[PDB]
Amino acid sequence: LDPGLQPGQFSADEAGAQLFAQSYQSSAEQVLFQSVAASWAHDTNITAENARRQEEAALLSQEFAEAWGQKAKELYEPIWQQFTDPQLRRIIGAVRTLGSANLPLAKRQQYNALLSQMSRIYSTAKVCLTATCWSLDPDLTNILASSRSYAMLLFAWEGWHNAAGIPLKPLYEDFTALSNEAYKQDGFTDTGAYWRSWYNSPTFEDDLEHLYQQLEPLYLNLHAFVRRALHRRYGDRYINLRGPIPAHLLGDMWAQSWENIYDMVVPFPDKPNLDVTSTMLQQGWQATHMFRVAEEFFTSLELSPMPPEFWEGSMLEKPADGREVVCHASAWDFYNRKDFRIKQCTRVTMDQLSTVHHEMGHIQYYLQYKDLPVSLRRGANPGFHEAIGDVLALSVSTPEHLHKIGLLDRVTNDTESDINYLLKMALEKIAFLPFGYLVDQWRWGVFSGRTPPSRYNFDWWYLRTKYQGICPPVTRNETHFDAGAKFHVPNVTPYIRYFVSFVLQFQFHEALCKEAGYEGPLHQCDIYRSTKAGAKLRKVLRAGSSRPWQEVLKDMVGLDALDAQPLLKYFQLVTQWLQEQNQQNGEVLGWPEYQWHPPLPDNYPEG
Ligand SMILES: *[C@@H]1O[C@H](CO[C@@H]2O[C@@H](C)[C@@H](O)[C@@H](O)[C@@H]2O)[C@@H](O[C@@H]2O[C@H](CO)[C@@H](O[C@@H]3O[C@H](CO)[C@@H](O)[C@H](O)[C@@H]3O)[C@H](O)[C@H]2NC(C)=O)[C@H](O)[C@H]1NC(C)=O
Ligand SMILES: CC(=O)N[C@@H](CC(=O)O)C(=O)N[C@@H](Cc1ccccc1)P(=O)(O)C[C@@H](C)C(=O)N[C@@H](C)C(N)=O
Ligand SMILES: *[C@@H]1O[C@H](CO)[C@@H](O[C@@H]2O[C@H](CO)[C@@H](O)[C@H](O)[C@H]2NC(C)=O)[C@H](O)[C@H]1NC(C)=O
Ligand SMILES: *[C@@H]1O[C@H](CO[C@@H]2O[C@@H](C)[C@@H](O)[C@@H](O)[C@@H]2O)[C@@H](O)[C@H](O)[C@H]1NC(C)=O
Ligand SMILES: [Cl-]
Ligand SMILES: [Zn+2]
Numbered sequence: 001l002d003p004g005l006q007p008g009q010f011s012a013d014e015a016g017a018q019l020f021a022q023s024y025q026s027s028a029e030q031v032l033f034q035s036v037a038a039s040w041a042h043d044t045n046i047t048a049e050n051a052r053r054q055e056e057a058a059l060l061s062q063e064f065a066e067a068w069g070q071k072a073k074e075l076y077e078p079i080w081q082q083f084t085d086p087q088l089r090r091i092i093g094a095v096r097t098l099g100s101a102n103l104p105l106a107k108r109q110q111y112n113a114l115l116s117q118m119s120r121i122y123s124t125a126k127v128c129l130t131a132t133c134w135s136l137d138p139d140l141t142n143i144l145a146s147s148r149s150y151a152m153l154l155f156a157w158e159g160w161h162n163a164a165g166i167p168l169k170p171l172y173e174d175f176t177a178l179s180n181e182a183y184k185q186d187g188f189t190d191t192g193a194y195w196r197s198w199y200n201s202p203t204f205e206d207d208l209e210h211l212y213q214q215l216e217p218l219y220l221n222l223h224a225f226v227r228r229a230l231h232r233r234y235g236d237r238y239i240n241l242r243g244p245i246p247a248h249l250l251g252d253m254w255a256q257s258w259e260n261i262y263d264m265v266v267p268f269p270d271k272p273n274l275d276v277t278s279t280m281l282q283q284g285w286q287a288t289h290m291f292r293v294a295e296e297f298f299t300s301l302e303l304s305p306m307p308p309e310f311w312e313g314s315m316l317e318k319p320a321d322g323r324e325v326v327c328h329a330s331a332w333d334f335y336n337r338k339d340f341r342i343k344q345c346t347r348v349t350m351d352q353l354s355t356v357h358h359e360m361g362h363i364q365y366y367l368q369y370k371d372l373p374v375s376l377r378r379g380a381n382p383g384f385h386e387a388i389g390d391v392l393a394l395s396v397s398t399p400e401h402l403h404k405i406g407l408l409d410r411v412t413n414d415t416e417s418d419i420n421y422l423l424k425m426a427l428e429k430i431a432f433l434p435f436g437y438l439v440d441q442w443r444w445g446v447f448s449g450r451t452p453p454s455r456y457n458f459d460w461w462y463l464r465t466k467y468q469g470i471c472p473p474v475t476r477n478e479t480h481f482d483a484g485a486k487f488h489v490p491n492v493t494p495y496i497r498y499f500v501s502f503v504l505q506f507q508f509h510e511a512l513c514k515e516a517g518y519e520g521p522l523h524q525c526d527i528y529r530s531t532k533a534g535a536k537l538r539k540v541l542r543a544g545s546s547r548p549w550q551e552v553l554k555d556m557v558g559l560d561a562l563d564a565q566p567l568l569k570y571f572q573l574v575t576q577w578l579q580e581q582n583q584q585n586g587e588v589l590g591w592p593e594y595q596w597h598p599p600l601p602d603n604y605p606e607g
Pocket of ligand 1: 413519520
């Protein structure tokens with residue numbers, strides 16, 4: 001570690017701790033910058049040389065974390081918990097937590113190598129037909145979205161899960177052991193306990209379960225309605241009206257968003273088509289247009305435009321040359337107050353327009369808290385960061401807003417159109433909830449040891465069936481590692497943030513709509529051009545993590561806790577309508593035939 005990045009001396013009291021924290025944050029910026037820069041260089045250009053460079057950067061970050069962490073423990077370990085300043089307790093409390101820097105050098109290198117190899121495997125995995133091979137994005141993504149052939153969807157689904165999952169399993173087992181070893185030295189029972197601690201709620205898991213109980217009936221009714229719609233097209237052989245839905249038929253590789261099957265489930269087709277994708281294609285929208293349109297919404301609220309450095313630095317399409325990249329969308333803060341970038345393999349699609357807003361929400365957060373000390377440059381909690389762009393996309397997707405940006409003919413304000421819209425939104429928001437909840441339940445079980453390598457897939461599919469009411473379309477066994485075929489698993493990034501964000505975004509939307517002076521139904525609100533809504537949002541963004549999330553939320557929303565009521569209020573009309581329809585159709589809610597799996601196609605797997 002460079003002499004300039006090593007800690008000096010400070011007194012072993014609160015006053016010295018304040019000076020320690022100030023000096024720590026000054027040095028940390030340079031270390032963060034080199035770390036991010038090397039990660040950017042690899043993720044936008046996957047090579048062996050770029051991977052080695054990223055691994056060296058990770059080692060340097062560990063050296064830094066070790067030096068300052070040991071210093072913090074030397075001076076403050078027995079006293080930091082009694083410090084009067086709560087912001088100071090949070091920062092020193094973080095610095096005393098070494099993580100992977102707790103590992104001996106050999107194991108540090110092993111840990112970094114594993115992360116690199118898992119990332120490489122996930123992003124370079126392909127499905128081969130003789131010589132031509134399909135990638136996840138765009139090839140397999142397009143197939144799951146637009147193919148309605150049971151056999152083709154199966155080939156894509158099985159191909160991907162096999163190609164990504166199988167080689168990942170041995171690496172994931174080793175990562176889990178090393179990660180646990182690291183965090184146990186910091187006093188956590190396991191890595192899952194550390195991840196959960198970010199929410200600073202002693203009742204976090206029970207709070208989540210209470211939230212889910214209120215939401216589950218909405219999912220069960222959506223599920224039943226959708227299952228019936230699928231049965232009408234795939235037939236009694238491939239769809240069991242009392243069983244789980246085959247996992248490959250919902251428009252998405254992980255069945256986590258069902259928006260792609262909207263045309264099959266739309267109750268009133270004679271009304272204007274709310275899926276704006278075909279209109280975007282006809283008009284000739286490109287990635288550039290999508291990002292500029294997203295930017296203009298942010299500026300309409302008097303938030304910050306994207307800086308020159310963003311436009312010059314970002315990767316907004318999958319590169320046309322012979323470059324392999326990480327295609328999963330991401331937003332990047334370089335911690336230099338100047339460089340902020342998005343890397344997205346943008347496709348011309350309505351849901352991708354929502355994803356553009358999502359990523360720009362992360363950037364906007366970075367732009368707003370860039371002048372804070374580096375440790376405060378995060379969301380109030382991870383759920384906040386994930387909610388920002390989604391809140392704005394709720395306004396963008398309204399038929400009225402779509403009309404304003406030229407993507408829809410003036411829509412009527414009638415009950416049929418409302419049901420169509422809310423159903424579309426339910427496919428995107430309600431359908432996701434069970435998946436958002438289950439992923440880290442699986443992962444927490446793995447970190448805790450409740451789920452050993454011998455039950456990885458057994459426990460994955462237990463949760464997928466329990467929550468989502470889906471089943472694998474082909475037989476799986478413990479050689480398969482289907483959890484690993486989801487980006488966030490091999491990329492070691494937590495998932496509960498997304499469940500939190502999907503609830504939180506409706507709380508934000510309600511608060512911002514009220515501030516904007518809007519007086520109608522919540523699902524018809526559009527905050528576009530509301531400088532008052534803008535100012536309220538900006539206060540949250542400029543706060544960073546300087547204050548407990550409960551207090552930030554109280555100031556914005558009037559409540560100091562996550563609450564499902566705004567989501568329920570938003571969806572109320574379609575919730576009632578789906579209940580009524582399922583009752584009339586004589587549906588069974590749930591999947592009592594839990595053991596049911598669909599048969600294989602006759603000519604499996606050829607075609
Ligand atoms: C779509 O239409 C709804 C409903 O419109 C109402 O019902 C129809 C069947 C017709 O009778 C319409 O003539 C009638 O307006 C609209 O929602 C309604 O918006 C109005 C105006 O924003 C709301 O009135 C306000 O109510 C608050 C208290 O809640 C008062 O403080 C205000 O002074 C003001 O009177 C009204 O509450 C609301 N109605 C319902 C049932 O929610 C909606 O505006 C419209 N949407 C679009 C995009 O055009
Ligand atoms: C970790 C980081 O540098 N930026 C985060 C945003 C932030 O916390 O500042 C990010 O880009 N995070 C992205 C996911 C990611 C996480 C870690 C590495 C690479 C990608 P995202 O949440 O914006 C991508 C988003 C499309 C996503 O994954 N959504 C969920 C619902 C999903 N499964 O599709
Ligand atoms: C992808 O990364 C490689 C390095 O892994 C880059 O190749 C280097 O390019 C610079 C300048 O063009 C040369 O000085 C090096 O000799 C190259 N290294 C190797 C190992 O070939 C490459 O430029 C990157 N690709 C893109 C499009 O940025
Ligand atoms: C796990 O399953 C692997 C491949 O899947 C199997 O083969 C196909 C063609 C079908 O018959 C399907 O029903 C089977 O699941 C096997 O190669 C492998 O032996 C299995 N792993 C273990 C440990 O038994
Ligand atoms: Cl999280
Ligand atoms: Zn995100």
